[PDB]
Design an enzyme around this catalytic site. Structure first.
Site, PDB file in Angstrom:
ATOM      1  N   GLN A   1       1.469  -4.229  23.646  1.00  0.00           N
ATOM      2  CA  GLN A   1       2.168  -3.430  24.655  1.00  0.00           C
ATOM      3  C   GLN A   1       2.066  -1.951  24.305  1.00  0.00           C
ATOM      4  O   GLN A   1       2.098  -1.576  23.131  1.00  0.00           O
ATOM      5  CB  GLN A   1       3.630  -3.856  24.737  1.00  0.00           C
ATOM      6  CG  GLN A   1       3.810  -5.237  25.321  1.00  0.00           C
ATOM      7  CD  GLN A   1       5.262  -5.598  25.514  1.00  0.00           C
ATOM      8  OE1 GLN A   1       5.940  -5.058  26.381  1.00  0.00           O
ATOM      9  NE2 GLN A   1       5.751  -6.505  24.685  1.00  0.00           N
TER      10      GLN A   1
ATOM     11  N   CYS B   1      11.240 -12.229  16.532  1.00  0.00           N
ATOM     12  CA  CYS B   1       9.844 -12.559  16.786  1.00  0.00           C
ATOM     13  C   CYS B   1       9.404 -13.739  15.926  1.00  0.00           C
ATOM     14  O   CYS B   1       9.905 -13.938  14.816  1.00  0.00           O
ATOM     15  CB  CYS B   1       8.954 -11.345  16.502  1.00  0.00           C
ATOM     16  SG  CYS B   1       7.190 -11.574  16.803  1.00  0.00           S
TER      17      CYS B   1
ATOM     18  N   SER C   1       9.613  -6.523  25.276  1.00  0.00           N
ATOM     19  CA  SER C   1      10.156  -7.587  24.436  1.00  0.00           C
ATOM     20  C   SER C   1      11.529  -7.247  23.868  1.00  0.00           C
ATOM     21  O   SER C   1      12.299  -8.166  23.562  1.00  0.00           O
ATOM     22  CB  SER C   1       9.219  -7.922  23.265  1.00  0.00           C
ATOM     23  OG  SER C   1       7.851  -8.005  23.648  1.00  0.00           O
TER      24      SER C   1
HETATM   25  O1  LIG Z   1       3.446  -8.906  24.128  1.00  0.00           O
HETATM   26  C1  LIG Z   1       2.366  -8.532  24.631  1.00  0.00           C
HETATM   27  O2  LIG Z   1       2.199  -8.344  25.855  1.00  0.00           O
HETATM   28  C2  LIG Z   1       1.192  -8.297  23.698  1.00  0.00           C
HETATM   29  C3  LIG Z   1       1.568  -8.368  22.226  1.00  0.00           C
HETATM   30  C4  LIG Z   1       2.526  -7.271  21.823  1.00  0.00           C
HETATM   31  O3  LIG Z   1       2.598  -6.210  22.419  1.00  0.00           O
HETATM   32  C5  LIG Z   1       3.382  -7.533  20.665  1.00  0.00           C
HETATM   33  C6  LIG Z   1       3.594  -8.708  19.988  1.00  0.00           C
HETATM   34  C7  LIG Z   1       4.204  -8.453  18.736  1.00  0.00           C
HETATM   35  C8  LIG Z   1       4.512  -7.153  18.544  1.00  0.00           C
HETATM   36  S1  LIG Z   1       4.220  -6.219  19.930  1.00  0.00           S
END
Ligand code: A1EDZ
Ligand code: CL
Length: 147
Positions: free
Chosen positions: A115, A97, A138
């Site tokens: 998420q 990330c 992800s």
């Molecule tokens: O990715 C998405 O749809 C929203 C952001 C999300 O869930 C995350 C980003 C970093 C850790 S989890």
């Protein structure tokens, strides 16, 4: 009885009782003792070839399988729990990330932003607690609730 999310389980190798949380995938030996608008979390992400975007600052093309990503996550969890490695050190080195450069810190967030599996695990963690492997589109996450 037990707080919501927790269930009693039995070690296959030792027969000793332990406790497992099916929202965070955390497991621990001691009995867990019994929500805010916002929490702050760090995380370590390991992506795999089926990730929503199979690319990261570490690798232009992420090719590892989901099973390989879970094995890496499990290994990081072991080293964090034994104290051989710090969560922040492993996140800065190995998280797929963009938050790796901030030791995995995501800052504070509310429900409805993240998420869903990530949100649910984050809000079920107690302050200072670490999740087990948490699966999202992800990849596979280790989550540390800091606030
Ligand atoms: O990715 C998405 O749809 C929203 C952001 C999300 O869930 C995350 C980003 C970093 C850790 S989890
Ligand atoms: Cl790899």
């Amino acid at each position: 009885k037990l707080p919501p999310g927790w269930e009693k389980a039995m070690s296959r190798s030792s027969g000793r009782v332990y406790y497992f949380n099916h929202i965070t995938n955390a497991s621990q030996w001691e009995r867990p003792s019994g929500e805010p608008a916002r929490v702050r979390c760090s995380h370590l992400l390991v992506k795999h070839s089926q990730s929503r975007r199979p690319s990261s600052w570490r690798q232009e093309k992420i090719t590892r399988t989901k099973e390989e990503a879970l094995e890496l996550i499990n290994g990081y969890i072991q080293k964090i729990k034994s104290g051989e490695e710090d969560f922040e050190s492993l996140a800065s080195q190995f998280s797929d990330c963009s938050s790796a450069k901030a030791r995995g810190d995501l800052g504070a967030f509310s429900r409805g932003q993240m998420q869903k599996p990530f949100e649910d695990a984050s809000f079920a963690l107690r302050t200072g607690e670490m999740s087990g492997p948490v699966f999202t589109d992800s990849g596979i996450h280790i989550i540390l609730r800091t606030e």
